[PDB]
Design an enzyme around this catalytic site. Structure first.
Site, mmCIF file in Angstrom:
data_model
loop_
_atom_site.group_PDB
_atom_site.id
_atom_site.type_symbol
_atom_site.label_atom_id
_atom_site.label_comp_id
_atom_site.label_asym_id
_atom_site.label_seq_id
_atom_site.Cartn_x
_atom_site.Cartn_y
_atom_site.Cartn_z
ATOM 1 C CD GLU A 35 44.645 36.587 35.503
ATOM 2 O OE1 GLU A 35 45.169 36.134 36.554
ATOM 3 O OE2 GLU A 35 43.413 36.583 35.283
ATOM 4 C CG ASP A 48 41.139 24.819 43.986
ATOM 5 O OD1 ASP A 48 42.302 25.245 43.968
ATOM 6 O OD2 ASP A 48 40.464 24.690 42.943
ATOM 7 C CB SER A 50 44.412 24.412 41.548
ATOM 8 O OG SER A 50 43.717 25.631 41.737
ATOM 9 C CG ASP A 52 45.815 30.494 38.997
ATOM 10 O OD1 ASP A 52 45.290 29.391 38.797
ATOM 11 O OD2 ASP A 52 45.164 31.497 39.324
ATOM 12 N N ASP A 101 37.302 27.513 24.763
ATOM 13 C CA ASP A 101 36.561 26.478 25.480
ATOM 14 C C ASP A 101 35.092 26.814 25.670
#
Ligand SMILES: [Cl-]
Ligand SMILES: [Cl-]
Ligand SMILES: [Cl-]
Ligand SMILES: [Cl-]
Ligand SMILES: [Cl-]
Ligand code: NA
Length: 129
Positions: A35, A48, A50, A52, A101
């Site tokens: 990551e 979009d 957003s 990270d 989640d």
């Protein structure tokens, strides 16, 4: 901060991530490797709009507030900048919520594509833990 591999493993263990939701420490280290390359300051913009943030590339669409992701949520109740700190507490606490989640570590695309099903213990091998 750019962590070393064993240094990050040790920090994740101290913050209770080892075996959290059944995911061994090597899974978490492997996810951070792919990551962020272990860099707490990593940021990446998504198509979009957003972004990270941090060592585990936590997304502003759902998990943190950056003020520039319309219609998004802030389910970890934190500013996204808190996920860039040299102390990994905020990223760990939010990752614990994410992995709980329902989809486990599949929330991290790099984990699914580059860690899942591999010899993840290699990421903690040799470390004094
Ligand atoms: Cl490495
Ligand atoms: Cl492991
Ligand atoms: Cl926003
Ligand atoms: Cl830390
Ligand atoms: Cl799971
Ligand atoms: Na948000």
């Amino acid at each position: 901060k750019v962590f070393g591999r064993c240094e990050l493993a040790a920090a994740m263990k101290r913050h209770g991530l080892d075996n959290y939701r059944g995911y061994s420490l090597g899974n978490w280290v492997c996810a951070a490797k792919f990551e962020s390359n272990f860099n707490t300051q990593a940021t990446n913009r998504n198509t979009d709009g957003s972004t990270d943030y941090g060592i585990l590339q936590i997304n502003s669409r759902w998990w943190c507030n950056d003020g520039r992701t319309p219609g998004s949520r802030n389910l970890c109740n934190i500013p996204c900048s808190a996920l860039l700190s040299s102390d990994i507490t905020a990223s760990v606490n939010c990752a614990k919520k994410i992995v709980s989640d329902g989809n486990g570590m599949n929330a991290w695309v790099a984990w699914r594509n580059r860690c899942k099903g591999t010899d993840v213990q290699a990421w903690i091998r040799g470390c004094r833990l």
